[PDB]
Amino acid sequence: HHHMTPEQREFLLEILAEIIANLDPTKILEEPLRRGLLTPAELQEVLDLKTPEEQAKKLIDFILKLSPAEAQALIDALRAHGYQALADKLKKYLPLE
Numbered sequence: 001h002h003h004m005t006p007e008q009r010e011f012l013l014e015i016l017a018e019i020i021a022n023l024d025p026t027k028i029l030e031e032p033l034r035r036g037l038l039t040p041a042e043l044q045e046v047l048d049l050k051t052p053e054e055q056a057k058k059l060i061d062f063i064l065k066l067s068p069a070e071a072q073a074l075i076d077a078l079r080a081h082g083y084q085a086l087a088d089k090l091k092k093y094l095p096l097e
Contacts, residue, residue, distance in 0.1 A: 001064050002095035012093040016056035016063065019078070019086055020047075025059065027081060031073035038062050063094070071096045 019025060026043060046058045071094055078087035
């Protein structure tokens with residue numbers, strides 16, 4: 001991934017938490033899940049037993065391993081579920097091409 005500043009990290013974490021507050025991220029992670037980004041059980045562990053902020057801190061590790069097409073799929077999926085602003089914010093702060 002591209003270098004990230006602390007402000008960028010903070011924003012990316014905030015956006016991931018905001019997505020999680022509104023929408024099960026399983027729904028936007030379709031393509032990366034099909035491509036073995038993490039197992040179903042691993043994603044379940046990330047999402048169970050926590051606030052959206054704590055989930056975001058675990059989820060960011062997988063977000064930063066996305067390929068370019070996987071990152072785009074995630075952004076497209078946010079838009080397809082009705083979240084244009086979050087898709088735009090996520091695309092801005094993702095340190096990926």
